[PDB]
């Protein structure tokens, strides 16, 4: 019942703010809904052939889509009233979920492109004369040496961070069965192809 | 056909009974752009799947 | 509070730093962490971020930094030395690179924020190059360390490998721009800091070694930090650091002592809250109440990293050590910025950063108020102090010592020390500080110098602000109601004051064009114009790019023009420039102010121009560094050189004006070399007046440029996209659809994402970001920056080509069309009048 | 020394030289270093190499330019200063400075001044060019420009310069531009016969916060009240002064006896005990006014028995039956009625009468067309002053010097102004550009709305 | 079959107005 | 080519009786003129209200039309001028046609080339050379300067046509339209008559504007010449007049007809007052009134109906309203499958 | 509910719910009858309606 979406970059122009913008601007995202115009303005909808909006002066390379007038509402159409600005870009949350429990929680998954530390240029950095002057006291150890690097719940605990809203919480408040839309995120996302 | 769809879009931009069913004319997901028709579905690193679908 | 004010008097205890980096790399979140550390009552909500510097309504809605924000706060050091830090939180978006420069000129240090997962990106490279150009100290902070743990789940050795690759790539980038070897970076040098501002982690090698020394004692944290990075290993048999691995699988010192404890604490907090977290917190000495263990994983992790790491002292010590104070850092700033140079007496006085010297501010920013009717200038004081309610002399970008016209006397009202959300009113601001000056907005447009009146009359201006990239996107803006035309103009003025790279110009036809860098930049500009400055309805034309004009062939015939006095004749020819020479002029590689003996030697060496011919160079065409060169080639025995030199200046102005206003579509001219082949100057001094020579010089320039084969030049943007490896083909398809070609597609080392670098037409880049993000369903993201002018295909003077309105023309029909409509947009004639 | 020998003095055309526009560059929209091209009259970025003024000089072949702020002329193709006596008038057009000797001689002027276009005109009586149908502001500004003491105060800059201002106080912009327009109106050597208030209207709109816009036409009374209140604030330091140029000229002192009328649906004994309870008794409250508001009688609403459709008229003294102890006005409120009889205390040297028209009834706004029957030569307000202050004010005679009249229905109406030439004693009306010589007798046969009186 | 007069905007537009007239 | 369609705003209500009497004595016997002007001055009565009409003319008089057709004629002499009026009317012994001239030189010797006054709606067609148009524009702007380019605000346009087929409000074209209207308005004294810009339409055809728009006798007309912007000279569309040149006998222009919005509104209001005043009325009378109105409209326009796609919907809606009225008369509950027989 | 009860005849605004309940079905059924399971009267995800 949960889509494995890690960030809301999927909802680029398909979120609530974009739909508010489309309703206010009388257009509609292809996958989005259609609305009655917020203000009729039929007389002003069809403006005259001004010297400013003169098509003979307009260079056409790629037609201005409805999405363009929603992505940058204040730049692409006149009279952008009651319009909303959508979140530009959440950083791509590069989360790599484990596929086998029988594998270390901290693992260099093949999905990662290899780092391939190059030795073409010998990396030179100021490092003192080795093993001659500085010595650690016998009571000095790494902070958590007894603690293991990962337990059995480390992978599942990390995968809980990148989980839908009800499942990324440790605690919370009890809701009513009415107030829990199980299929709300099914139509909030894009319709499956075919 | 689809080549004239782009030009038509440019021109258009610049120049009793109970119905339980929803009319197919109400559909908005109609596009002339091949980019906006055959969108690239999220692969989710080959390890994520859309909800509901088996 | 009062200690903050009393700390400004000592110029040695002040650090002027700017936090610059790629888009969404944690600079704003890092400043939020610093503010929370300094302000006990300011804490972020568990779900929402703080975004203290994101004060604009646009920023809190777009989620992207729009404008640079000043934050003046007192931060303790590792030892506890409370330094005063003036942080300029700059936007990470490339389109707002100018907003960085406004904060980069008044900063003595640069903090390059780099995402650990993403690494070095486009804006990161641009910012390090630009900061090296202004000769600023560069220190690096790798933010979002948790993305190597909680997202990639890399092994600690591989996390160290990713960090080392990130640090070593910046070293290989600075070497391409900085000759000085001191600009090298290494966390053991103190140059490089590690952080995760989401969970309030901030440590350098020195800071983490200090934590170790506080836990166990009898440890030199400096010496310990000297051996906490690189191929150095730790042997517990001898308790000593050895360059060779004591065992078969001995982890490095950084992995064993730094990355291992951080990995384990994060793993315990995110996976074992109920089982092992209290035990490991007792082991680490952290005590969390019963209610503090009831919080969700992310707030609990942030709290436990706040307790373990404490203050952000690693950032403070890095900035203190490797970023010069205004007292010591003034001399390179004065040399690179002051027009009179350091040799000037005023320059020498300003090099000492004396609080008792003559007043010399340098305003680079202009911040609007709540109502938008008054602007507060913002600038760095370089010498003397500025007092509230004090008459001062405010210069301008066009002011010279000979011309007191551009300087207006204005009274400084209240002065504020600005820290993000709030401002503390002060009476005086000593030198080396940042100040919000009120009452000097009227003479200031973009950048000005504030000094004292009736004294220090020999005071030139600081150099005009130099921007990383050229603004080529152009949008025409009219009022919906023409009766409200002045208000728009008023609003236009305001946006011109508020955006450093904005260019508002009224055309011949009466269209007011605004110049911006990209779609988001112009969207924000129009939002500001409509919502807070003009408050009127506004009509915006379809975005278009600016074009240039070039030649590809030598002019067929010698083009002559004679003055209306019918006594002066100029015969000129036009030739295209060599590859890279125009870029060399633009990059200020060579200046017309160079000594003439070596100026000719440059063209004789890199381009093999004749020494006598190279010495005949007159000027850099339209701009001091403009990409057009005017070269004399008159026969010495046919034209009197002494007499020709009399009208040399007038010919120079005519050349500059003609190159600035092209004949094709009234645009710039690029990559053209005009050779003067014949001069016939009237022997009488008053018959060779500039008022006749300059129009004639422009006319002959136009004729020669037209006879040489004209070509239109369009800007090409350089676009890098970071997308999942599956989405590379979709990016290729989109770019091929929008006339763009991919130059490279390289995987990001240490992340599955691939970076695709391509070149796209700027006029074809409108909606390219939206097309890419929508087609890839948000997985691919693009940042576009202007890269270079390129010849558009087709003959621009082909009269036979017919243009169909509302159709995207083919490639050979582009160059013609791009002219004609542009001419129609300028109010010019239908075709190019060659006979004119 | 190539100055003082320019060959382009004949190139200047004073006809197109209109300085009433905003001093901003026509290309860069920059208000700094504004330079006007005297050949074409268009402002540019400023004198200097690679500047818009230089470009225009080398493009249009226009050589002589005038610096808007420095008031100095330059040749841009060679960029050298120009000094010539014949140019002084041009500067005097841009910045008309009046000496103290000339300021006091403006009220004794009886000569028809000559302009550059030959259209003879009287100083002060100059048509204000309508911009976007806002003739109410033009009428109010003309009426205030006709005031001698206010004019003399505003003719000299140092009267209202070097005063301390609050940092965020844009109110100065209203008073520093009113002086400019007023000295443009009274300049007797204008290039054009009229004056464009387009420069001041911007300050009026900006200071009023979008009300009294240029496009719309507001009420003259409301605009006059706002302007008089704003000028009072615009003068003085951070704290307003008790005696500004508006208080001592227009402000007078009036006394009000506010008695609360009991509700009619009460017992007579209960009524008298409520009156005794001090809740329904007179309360003398002094106050100050910038103008006296005069209520008009209601329209007859019916034809007369003999002369059907007779225009309603009322003598001025019947309108001025207000402001005395004898008469009362039952002011009705949705809560309760009040009995407020007024009593003048101090008559200002210049008394403004605002006749109440454009009254909003229960459904819309209607104008009372009653004709005010007033004399234009001599009156006496001694009967309208209390006995205590009658000795203090030895003068109670006022002469009409300015009159506003509204023609047309309140939905769309024009504002004409009749101004009395103080020097000659003649009356001239000016509706925007139009100026005519109406006989003084025909002044009183108009639907007066705002009047200005001088006590001499 | 409803008998409602339907608009002929786009309906019966093939034929001219001179048809069926003499 | 600039065409100005307008109307004298209140000619009927502003015909001075003394001046009208003098002008009538000019053309008719003084006894007849005195009788007519005295008949125009009588007591207007309605219920309890009555007054005397001493300023305007009474249009209920049988000869009033003549008076109008005379008074408007005077306005023509004020608009065209005696010279151009004589050129249009031709020599008194060889009167010209409705739209014709004795010689081509007389046709081309004045800006005003066509004129028709109708009753109160004057249509004027000027042809302007570039120099003449520029001179008129400068003369108009001398007393009406427009620094803000505000001439486009109040410029009326025929919104029933699409943006490309409408008149294009270019700066020079709008300036010329304003100049022409101001020139025409200056000729007529403001007291004898007046022309109002809001209740008037000026359409100019130039390089910028390819379509010549106007409205006359309820017809929204647009001429698009074949020379410039005629991709195909289609003939199948029956709502399009195919203009022809009488000299070359060749296809030169193309006229598109359309029903004016005012005519559609008038028909809709007529149907409304047919329907609402049909309470205690026979079905036959209602259908007869509907048939009379419909046949009047359809036989008046006969071509402008097909292009006015809104008129078709209006007509079918009105027919449905009438049929619903009849059905409700037959039975309160509406039928489901009422037949058309 | 419209077919079972026909309560839309006494409240037309109720149709808004009815059209929604069908819509949710199209959302659920085509997520349900996707794999080897085909169309049929077996889906029982009744929470939404």
Numbering used by the authors:
A (entry chain A): 245 to 438
B (entry chain G): 241 to 255, 270 to 308
C (entry chain C): 116 to 951
D (entry chain U): 100 to 555
E (entry chain B): 36 to 57
F (entry chain A): 974 to 1314
G (entry chain A): 585 to 633
Show the paper's wording.
Here cryo-electron microscopy analyses of human CE pre-B complex and B-like complexes reveal extensive structural similarities with their CI counterparts. The results indicate that the CE and CI spliceosome assembly pathways converge already at the pre-B stage. Add-back experiments using purified CE pre-B complexes, coupled with cryo-electron microscopy, elucidate the order of the extensive remodelling events that accompany the formation of B complexes and B-like complexes. The molecular triggers and roles of B-specific proteins in these rearrangements are also identified.
To that end, we determined cryo-EM structures of complexes formed after the addition of an excess of 5′ss oligo to affinity-purified CE pre-B dimers in the absence or presence of ATP or ATPγS. The cryo-EM structures of the protomers of affinity-purified CE pre-B dimers incubated with 5′ss oligo (designated pre-B5′ss) or with 5′ss oligo plus ATPγS (designated pre-B5′ss+ATPγS) were determined at 4.2 Å and 3.1 Å, resolution, respectively, at their tri-snRNP cores. These include PRP31, PRP6 and PRP8RH, which are also repositioned in B-like complexes. In pre-B5′ss+ATPγS, BRR2 and the tightly bound PRP8 Jab1/MPN domain (PRP8Jab1) undergo a large-scale translocation. BRR2–PRP8Jab1 is now anchored to its new position at the tip of PRP8En through the PRP8RH–PRP8Jab1 linker, the ends of which are stably bound to PRP8En at the same position as in the B-like complex. However, in pre-B5′ss+ATPγS, BRR2–PRP8Jab1 does not reach the conformational state and position that it adopts in B-like complexes, which would require a rotation of BRR2 around its long axis and substantial structural rearrangement in its helicase domains. The U4 snRNA quasi-pseudoknot is dissolved in pre-B5′ss+ATPγS, accompanied by displacement of RBM42 and SNRNP27K, but U4/U6 stem III is still present and, together with the U4 Sm core, adopts a new position.
